[PDB]
Structure formats: C-alpha cells, structure tokens
Amino acid sequence: HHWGYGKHNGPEHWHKDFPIAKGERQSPVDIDTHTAKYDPSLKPLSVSYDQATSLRILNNGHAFNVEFDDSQDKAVLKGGPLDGTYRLIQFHFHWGSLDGQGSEHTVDKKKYAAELHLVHWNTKYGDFGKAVQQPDGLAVLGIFLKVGSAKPGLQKVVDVLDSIKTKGKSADFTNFDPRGLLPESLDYWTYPGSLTTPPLLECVTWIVLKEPISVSSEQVLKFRKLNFNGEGEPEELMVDNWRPAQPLKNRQIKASFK
Ligand SMILES: NS(=O)(=O)c1ccc(NC(=O)Cn2ccc(=O)[nH]c2=O)cc1
Ligand SMILES: [Zn+2]
C-alpha cells in the first residue's frame, strides 16, 4: 500500500508515511500574481543547455523521466535567485485527465493542462542524493503547458511513450535537446519549497516561468495513454499525477519582472 494518486493513497494520505507533507515549505503553491513582489536584485536566469546529453526515458510508475548525463557540467542552470551552478539531471511532467487540470502550481488559482519540471542539483554537494538533504540542494525550473498549437520540440518525447507504457519500462533516449521545450521569455517567479512527490524533502528553490508553452491536444492525449501499473497488472491510466497547492505559510513569492 504505497503512495500514489488514487483515492486511497493520494496526496491527502502522504503525511502518514511522510510527516514533512505538513511542513513549513511544501510545494506546489498557488502563485498570487498581485501579492508576488518584484525583486529588482534578482538576476536574469542563465539556462545553458547547448551541451546537454540525454540518455534514457523511464516510466517510474508516477511519471516519466527523461534522464541526462550529470557527471559533468554539460547542461546547467545558474543566475536568477541561485548561488552557484546547478546541473540538469532529469525532466518530467505532471498532467490531468482533462485539459482543465494537471498543473501543480497554479496562477491566481488557474490550473494549466500540465506542468514540466526540469530538475537540477547544486554541484557544491557532489551528487543528487546529498543535494536533496540540503535547503539549497535543488533548483527546479517549472513550465506550464496549455493546449493549443503543437510544440514541435516535444514530439520526440510523445513518440517514444508507446515503448514505456508501463511502470519500470525504459528506453534509450539520446540526443534530445531540452531547449525545444522552453518558452520565449524567461521571466519567472521564485520561492523556497519542496519536492512535490514523496519524500517531499524541503530542498528546492522553485523557479516557475510566467510564459506557458503550447502543446496540442494530440500531444497531451498521448501522455494520458501511459499506465501507472506494471505490465500484466490491471490497467490504470497515468493521469492526474499532480499534487494540489499547499499552504504558503511564512514565505514570499518574488517576481523577476514588473
Ligand atoms: N516533482 S519535483 O518536485 O520536481 C521532483 C523532482 C525530483 C524528484 N526525485 C528525483 O529526481 C530522484 N531521481 C534522481 C535521478 C534520476 O535520474 N531520477 C530520479 O528520479 C522527486 C520530485
Ligand atoms: Zn515534478
């Protein structure tokens, strides 16, 4: 009886195995755009993905992860609210059963159809496992998805999903360029938070871009054909794998833009 997104093991149950679920800096949150304060001392984000080396795509039973070689400074996030260099290790998405829900963060209570998370770890801690034990260990770049025009740079991801339908399946996934998933503007909100799945560790500087990307209805429909279950188990569609907004508590969301 492990955690998931069903009626009996979903987000409202997670605190029983992971008491930090009720902690002081949990994610996601609602971004109230009128209360977020412009911080002119924030620097522009630096997204340096030209040398990124993707390796594999994995259905882990909760989402699918596109994994990268993080044994060198190849794809890094710097600047913005960050001190130091954060290396890209994986990206994944959260999405809904319907276009009206799916994102984890919300904007003035608006839910997007999906949300992309590009996960990076602070190189001063040496590896990801040590980084998640630190309050400034991770930087997650969050990007909202709305349904409209197709995102051409997403299609290579969509087309491999048939090969990783069920939990525990992986496939080679080399030469994928995550620059094709970015919007035009890098304007962002930022706040201190957590992993949005167990173990819910309070180790993330969240950087959420204001500009969503557009994906097509056909692209998101293919996300919804994935399975939470393993092969040869009863089919449960991988949909609504999002945690709802958590209390902001004693935190301020800062904006990079006026
Ligand atoms: N929704 S989230 O807050 O961004 C969030 C982000 C990351 C995690 N955990 C990991 O990444 C662990 N890990 C590490 C290397 C890897 O290759 N694959 C992988 O899974 C959990 C939640
Ligand atoms: Zn995530």
UniProtKB/Swiss-Prot annotation:
Result for mutant: residue 3 to A: Impaired activity, not rescued by 4-methylimidazole (4-MI)
Catalytic reaction annotation: hydrogencarbonate + H(+) = CO2 + H2O; urea = cyanamide + H2O
Entry's Gene Ontology BP terms: angiotensin-activated signaling pathway; carbon dioxide transport; morphogenesis of an epithelium; neuron cellular homeostasis; positive regulation of cellular pH reduction; positive regulation of dipeptide transmembrane transport; positive regulation of synaptic transmission, GABAergic; regulation of chloride transport
Residue numbers binding substrate: 196-197
Entry function: Catalyzes the reversible hydration of carbon dioxide. Can also hydrate cyanamide to urea. Stimulates the chloride-bicarbonate exchange activity of SLC26A6. Essential for bone resorption and osteoclast differentiation. Involved in the regulation of fluid secretion into the anterior chamber of the eye. Contributes to intracellular pH regulation in the duodenal upper villous epithelium during proton-coupled peptide absorption.
Oligomer and partners: Interacts with SLC4A4. Interaction with SLC4A7 regulates SLC4A7 transporter activity. Interacts with SLC26A6 isoform 4 (via C-terminus cytoplasmic domain).
Annotated effect of mutating residue 63 to S: 2-fold decrease in enzyme efficiency, as determined by kcat/KM ratio, and efficiently inhibited by chlorzolamide
Effect ascribed to mutating residue 195 to E/H/R: Strongly reduced CO(2) hydrase activity
Result after altering residue 90 to P: In OPTB3; in Czechoslovakia
Sample GO molecular function, one term: carbonate dehydratase activity
UniProt gene name: CA2
Cellular compartment(s): Cytoplasm; Cell membrane
Major localization class: cytoplasm
Record protein name field: Carbonic anhydrase 2
Xref: PANTHER family: CARBONIC ANHYDRASE, CARBONIC ANHYDRASE 2
Site description Involved in the binding of some activators, including histamine and L-histidine, residues in chain: 90
Effect upon mutating residue 196 to D/E: Strongly reduced activity, but enhanced zinc affinity
Residues of the site described as Fine-tunes the proton-transfer properties of H-64: 5, 60, 65
Annotated effect of mutating residue 195 to A: Reduced CO(2) hydrase activity
Binding site for Zn(2+): 92, 94, 117
Further comment found in the protein's record: Target of drugs used in treatments against glaucoma disorder and breast cancer.
Effect of substituting residue 60 to L: Reduced activity
Reported impact of residue 117 to E: Strongly reduced activity
Effect after changing residue 65 to H: Enhanced proton transfer
